[PDB]
Design a protein around this nucleic acid. Sequence first.
RNA 1: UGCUGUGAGGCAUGCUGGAGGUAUCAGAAGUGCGAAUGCUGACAUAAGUAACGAUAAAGCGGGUGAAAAGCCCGCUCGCCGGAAGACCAAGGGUUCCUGUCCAACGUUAAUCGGGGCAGGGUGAGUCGACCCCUAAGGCGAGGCCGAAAGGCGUAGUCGAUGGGAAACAGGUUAAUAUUCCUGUACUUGGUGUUACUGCGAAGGGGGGACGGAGAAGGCUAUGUUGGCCGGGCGACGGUUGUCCCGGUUUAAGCGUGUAGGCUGGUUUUCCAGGCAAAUCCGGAAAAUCAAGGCUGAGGCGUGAUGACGAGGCACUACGGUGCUGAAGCAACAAAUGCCCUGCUUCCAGGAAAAGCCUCUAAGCAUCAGGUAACAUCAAAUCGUACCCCAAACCGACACA
RNA 2: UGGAGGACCGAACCGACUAAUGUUGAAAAAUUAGCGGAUGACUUGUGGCUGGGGGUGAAAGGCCAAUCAAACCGGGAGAU
RNA 3: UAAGGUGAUAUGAACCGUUAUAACCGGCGAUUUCCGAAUGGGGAAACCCAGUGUGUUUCGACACACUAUCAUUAACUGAAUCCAUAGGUUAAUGAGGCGAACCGGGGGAACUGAAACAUCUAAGUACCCCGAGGAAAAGAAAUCAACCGAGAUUCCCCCAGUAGCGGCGAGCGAACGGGGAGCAGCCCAGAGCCUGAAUCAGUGUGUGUGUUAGUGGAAGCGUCUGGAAAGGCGCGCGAUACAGGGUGACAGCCCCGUACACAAAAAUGCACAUGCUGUGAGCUCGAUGAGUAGGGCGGGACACGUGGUAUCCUGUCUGA
Lengths: 92, 62, 838
Amino acid sequence: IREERLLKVLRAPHVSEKASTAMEKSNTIVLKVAKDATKAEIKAAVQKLFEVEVEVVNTLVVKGKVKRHGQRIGRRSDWKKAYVTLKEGQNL
Amino acid sequence: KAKELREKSVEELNTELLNLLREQFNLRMQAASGQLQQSHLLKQVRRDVARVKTLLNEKAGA
Amino acid sequence: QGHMMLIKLLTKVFGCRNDRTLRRMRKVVNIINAMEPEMEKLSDEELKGKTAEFRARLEKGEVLENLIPEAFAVVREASKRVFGMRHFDVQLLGGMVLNERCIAEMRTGEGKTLTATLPAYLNALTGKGVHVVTVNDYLAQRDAENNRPLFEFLGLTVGINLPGMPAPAKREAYAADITYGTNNEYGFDYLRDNMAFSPEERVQRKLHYALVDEVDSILIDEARTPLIISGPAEDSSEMYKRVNKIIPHLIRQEKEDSETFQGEGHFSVDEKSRQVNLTERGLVLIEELLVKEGIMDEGESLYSPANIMLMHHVTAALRAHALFTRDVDYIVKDGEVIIVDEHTGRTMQGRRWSDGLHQAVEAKEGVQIQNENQTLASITFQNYFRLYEKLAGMTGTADTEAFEFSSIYKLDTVVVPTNRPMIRKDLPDLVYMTEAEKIQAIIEDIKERTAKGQPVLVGTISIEKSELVSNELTKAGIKHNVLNAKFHANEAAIVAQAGYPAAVTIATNMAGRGTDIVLGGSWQAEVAALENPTAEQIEKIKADWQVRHDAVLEAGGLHIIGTERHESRRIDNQLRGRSGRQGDAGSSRFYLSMEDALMRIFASDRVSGMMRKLGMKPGEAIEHPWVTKAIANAQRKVESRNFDIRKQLLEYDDVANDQRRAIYSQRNELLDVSDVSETINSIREDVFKATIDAYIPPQSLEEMWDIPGLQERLKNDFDLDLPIAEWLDKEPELHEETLRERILAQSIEVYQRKEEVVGAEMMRHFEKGVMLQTLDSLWKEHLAAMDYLRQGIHLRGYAQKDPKQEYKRESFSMFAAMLESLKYEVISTLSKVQVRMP
RNA sequence: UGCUGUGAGGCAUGCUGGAGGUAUCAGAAGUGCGAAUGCUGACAUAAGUAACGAUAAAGCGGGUGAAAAGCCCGCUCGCCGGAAGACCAAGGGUUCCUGUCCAACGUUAAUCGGGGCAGGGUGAGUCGACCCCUAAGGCGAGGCCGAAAGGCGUAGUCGAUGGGAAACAGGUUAAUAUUCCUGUACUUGGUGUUACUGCGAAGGGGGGACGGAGAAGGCUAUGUUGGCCGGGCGACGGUUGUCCCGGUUUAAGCGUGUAGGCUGGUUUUCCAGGCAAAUCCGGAAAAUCAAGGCUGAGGCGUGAUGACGAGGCACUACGGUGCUGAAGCAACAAAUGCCCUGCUUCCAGGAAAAGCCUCUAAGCAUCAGGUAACAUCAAAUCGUACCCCAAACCGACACA
RNA sequence: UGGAGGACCGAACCGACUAAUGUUGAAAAAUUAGCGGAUGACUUGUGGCUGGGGGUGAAAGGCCAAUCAAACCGGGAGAU
RNA sequence: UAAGGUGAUAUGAACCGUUAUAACCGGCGAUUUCCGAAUGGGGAAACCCAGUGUGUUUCGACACACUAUCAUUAACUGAAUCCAUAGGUUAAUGAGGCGAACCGGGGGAACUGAAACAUCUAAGUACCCCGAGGAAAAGAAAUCAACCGAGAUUCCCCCAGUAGCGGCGAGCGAACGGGGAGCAGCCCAGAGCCUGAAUCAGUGUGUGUGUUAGUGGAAGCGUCUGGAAAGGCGCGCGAUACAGGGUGACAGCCCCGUACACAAAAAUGCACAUGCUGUGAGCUCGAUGAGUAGGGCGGGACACGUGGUAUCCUGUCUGA
Ligand SMILES: [Mg+2]
Ligand SMILES: [Mg+2]
Ligand SMILES: [Mg+2]
Ligand SMILES: [Mg+2]
Ligand SMILES: [Mg+2]
Ligand SMILES: [Mg+2]
Ligand SMILES: [Mg+2]
Ligand SMILES: [Mg+2]
Ligand SMILES: [Mg+2]
Ligand SMILES: [Mg+2]
Ligand SMILES: [Mg+2]
Ligand SMILES: [Mg+2]
Ligand SMILES: [Mg+2]
Ligand SMILES: [Mg+2]
Ligand SMILES: [Mg+2]
Ligand SMILES: [Mg+2]
Ligand SMILES: [Mg+2]
Ligand SMILES: [Mg+2]
Ligand SMILES: [Mg+2]
Ligand SMILES: [Mg+2]
Ligand SMILES: [Mg+2]
Ligand SMILES: [Mg+2]
Ligand SMILES: [Mg+2]
Ligand SMILES: [Mg+2]
């Protein structure tokens, strides 16, 4: 896998109460990733850019909402959430 | 820049491109967590990458 | 908007976590001190008996934490009844913090040592000792003798550790329940206990609890610092003459003599590239340090994991031969080495480049050489604190960051309050364009504050900055006293009287948090100044001190001037927090100039020229808050930079001390166990399996064997003259392994004959002594190779690979080879012992 | 408002307005409106009139609130229960859940909402799509035909509504779960090692592979009762008993092969029908034994010393968490569901192709490739919230 | 014994014979109370095909997007 | 070119720049996701699924390129079948789709008018399809004229609503000739003498003239009313500039421009002039477009409706 592809995948950390709870239960980091990222690219990117080990990645596609800004109708962009399961022997 | 980068070899430009992509990823994670005050730097880093790639193209083709 | 992101997450989550912990602590506080109007029966028969009662309750299995609302009171009223100090609620909080692995944040004057009496009392009831560290013997002995009535009235012994104390008296120090002393005395007592030749010669106990008491210095800055590693008289070093003698056979164009040669390298003009880089990346000239007259010649190359100790010697000779030239870089006159400084024209006769460099300088010419010194005993301080079962520490208002604290080693940061409403007026910071306008504004401020009633501290970084500000201050005209870091008693004598009205103190490099600034004078040292105080003089001195102190708080308290800002914010808050202790009035103001050292981290002449385009404006304007934002951002940047350069060497300390704990665990495992004849027997059987495996292949045919090499190696390093080839060729009834058990049984009968003629327990003491000799010698060779590979990781991992898990693999292979050589040579020198035969 | 001309009109001026208008004499018209069931916009009338959308029905106390018949909590009352309950497909696309607001929307008020704003939420090797394969049918290289555009169609290639590999139980979120966690599995490929070896198709054969109706045998889901376990002796006569209430649950998978259904089996020799070849199928002739094979619900064992389990004890920012947790069986009844794509029976005589098994041709034969075991790796992408006899789909509406 | 039938009775389902209401309706064809078929020439889901001087029609000039004795949209067209 | 900027609703924050790598404008380049002729196969457009060849790296995979169809040409192969052909494979070049009107061709209405309606008219109009260029078509007499002559085609005005055609109804409607815009002639059907001699096309260079940024560009003050002067009043000045727009009411002299005078590193339009390449001129002797002209049958176009109907085109049979 080409490394400069891995440098473009992981867009943003995603924090919420569900991500808090998922970190407490099954120590999963929740990432905003690129729209076209597959699970192998995300696993290799977290294993390289964060120097940790990943067990498994579960990716879902969030569809953007439709908003009314000043009686003009727009639609927010879709994005991809990724639940990344850090390994049990890795402790933080 | 674009003149001090034009005086560099192909592997030097590739190493500089890798370093610029690493700083771009680090600044993107910094701004994504709400932590970046100097929000201009992302823009500069973006244009910097473009300069390197443009020079790479004019070192690759001609 | 949206996206309630990670920063507000950090603040909200940790704020609610500290508030919930403080709510439960407030409930515990409201439980313990619900009502205390009067107290009797000091500690004679009942509250000293609580010590034996708590030891009996832990003998039945009750948790020591369940005693926290009880046992604290057993301390508390004692400080009311011995010393007359009522423990405030914040002192209970800090003691409960120091009971766990957490950090206690509270201001000085709120009973620092009075808080520290609590967890020493709690951790001391285990019977293992309490190790509290001051920076000196002075405060340690002072608070040890202060708490000697407190611990003696409750049945606990106070041991003091001093440099120069006898080893049985050091045993009585550490075997006491509360042991006082400094950090280096503790660490080097540990290193001398690891240089003990029996477990009886140790002076320390098992490490129970370490109260740090100053976490700003030792946990961050003094984490790595070794002061005792090896002390040589050097006695001879002429073997490096026979190592550096191999060099003038070869020429400085190719074949291991090169100025790194880089394929082509450089031009033919003065090729001594003092930007050394020590590479020789051709990888064809590397062959000439191999065979022909013999060292590193059995078949191992120069990139082997087992030959680095010579590699940081021969390459040191190479960077002393062609690089550091005679009569300009250095001189040797009458056998004396002097570095001739090239840039400022000096002759450094009392300096020498370490890490074998001046040793190789002496090995090039005909100079007397100091010994190739071998590391014996070293440990880093943060990991020695990690070695304790319970670890906690307390600091002032200069607390570090909470995530940084928890990532040192498991230290939770809970903001303990002051129990007094804080009115320390932190003024907005003041920057000037030059030093002169800044210090003149400081001169007008110090004159107008010495006008009414105000004590002022002016803090600098150095003695010369203190000299410049005091020269400008006597151009204004005051009296001052500079705080020397060298002089502890003079520090206390200055700062104890610094809180007088119209008394100004100058500071040089604040270590941490100061001794207690008593504002409006100090009436306790005033009645100590009376040669025979009656009860009539103390009340008058207390009343005049009361008038001075209310005049001080009417004046605005203590003032702080910071002449510059440091590269860390902790020392800045250390300078700032002197004003307004225990809820008193106080003020603090920092000054800065554009020719300070904190403009040295900018390195951007564009923005440094854009600040000139503002204008002068010396005073009333609205000039720019953006430059102040730039200063704050750059200060946070260099604080994080200090964090990174700390963290890299912290990983280095982690890997070095992990190999240290490996050898110390196997050291105590091979030392502490009884009946070591069985241990020697088991290791001897594994030794003979391994040494026959190195020469005879397992499950090989009759021609694959190596008989004369095994015979000569047995004769050299076993004292066994075995007829191996005769024992092969005389009997064809022999088969496979069989020879392994034959040489093993011959070695066993040699050893049993020698132990019957030498005695049983004499052979046991000889076993333990020779085990210590061979183990310490090959372990200090392991330390030499480990230090040389931590200094010589510049040529191993370059292309797509990473050292430190390439350093760690080679050091683990060196560790395994050193342990097998340890076992082989222990069994050798136990089979080599010539005892007088009948 | 005043004056004046026969009239279309004209002149002057008060007030508003705050930047353009135009004498005279000529010139050109998009040059004059009350009508056309004229066109657009605005506003009356009927008139504060009909109506407020199933006659399933409400009453009280407390809460918040500026305000409570409608919102929240509680106690009653009434309605549906082959539905007005639950899960989906189609269709819709954020209506889901939380905070907040009550201008507009809601046939009334609203603190409420499927409304405004912000935030969060949809996690799959096994579910579905994708993918392999075809039906009706569509396009259709060439080809044939047609003034041109185009029309039909061969090889082919698409096309589900059909055929093809595999996961269940328990727990959890405010919002997802066969997707997350715990436990126990299973499937298909790749690579490597080992052992054995005749492998190979765009061909041949089998199989997939199929109708209606009826019957009654074995069962199961499920229900009832008893036993057992836990709790109760009861506002008003009686209620320590043949009394009252609640619980009495456990899967996939692995093993065993049962009720049942189908069929004789094995070996040798021969024939060229299966476009060529075949050891496979089809056919023929011997010998031998008569019991061999395929299929198959359910039960049983295991999964499971587990989970679940009424309840109890500790906390509990009252919303929950930690630990514990008794019995956890038997009989009877019983499906439209399973054996069953079976059996009988009729005439109207009841899809295709691929996956799968086998046979060889060309070809390669110590290779390759196949078979069996073990180890390792992979199973990508998309959908997953929510409504689905409905206030969210189709009917202009929160629509009998 | 057997279980045949464009067999019988009757729910789902399909339909629409009578009456009342509704007629600016709850509904641009329905509701209520009854009514006919309900193993067949049945009904229904998904997809496909047939195009207007045409289709399709167990045949009423019925249906072909709330339009049909020649659909709908645009044009000749400002037909006359 | 520049002291200001980072497009707008639209502020804010973070920054950059000020004498020339801020920004802006123009020329030439770079990148240019996916769908779309869509072109690797498919498809419910913006999606699914590949094959082949390279070249990596731990061996988990990755990155890039090509792969549609048709036409022509070449090469290699190659049936029934002997040669051969058909076919197949590969390579090279071209094409494909979009576009408002104009243009040429292949088809071609009906309402309507005739006061009904069928010949006719509407009308070769609308519309459909094909094809191309900046224009297309046409075009150098087998033409007109009238015994005198003109000398290719196209377009404008008269001829002229004339001669005619016509259920001689409604309607349709020339030509000869004249005045004008513009003007240009050649090649093959074939040999020799002479050659590359005229002409044309590509190509490069130079010059000229533009285009795509740009530069300079005149001349006014006082007072009154007024929120504000550009207005009233007073006295001046420019004009090859009193075209226009803005500035707190109506400005020649406040601003941008305006008349005028200049300007291109690079690309490029058009002219020449020059060089190269392809191409051949002139002279002599020839030769002079056959299923064609014309005819019979049936239609159509000529203003001309078969009429006494010339002429042109041909579906069919013929035929100098
Ligand atoms: Mg998973
Ligand atoms: Mg009009
Ligand atoms: Mg009107
Ligand atoms: Mg009313
Ligand atoms: Mg009424
Ligand atoms: Mg009414
Ligand atoms: Mg209602
Ligand atoms: Mg109420
Ligand atoms: Mg009921
Ligand atoms: Mg919405
Ligand atoms: Mg809701
Ligand atoms: Mg809400
Ligand atoms: Mg809502
Ligand atoms: Mg298909
Ligand atoms: Mg399907
Ligand atoms: Mg049952
Ligand atoms: Mg009673
Ligand atoms: Mg019961
Ligand atoms: Mg056979
Ligand atoms: Mg309603
Ligand atoms: Mg009915
Ligand atoms: Mg008609
Ligand atoms: Mg295609
Ligand atoms: Mg003819």
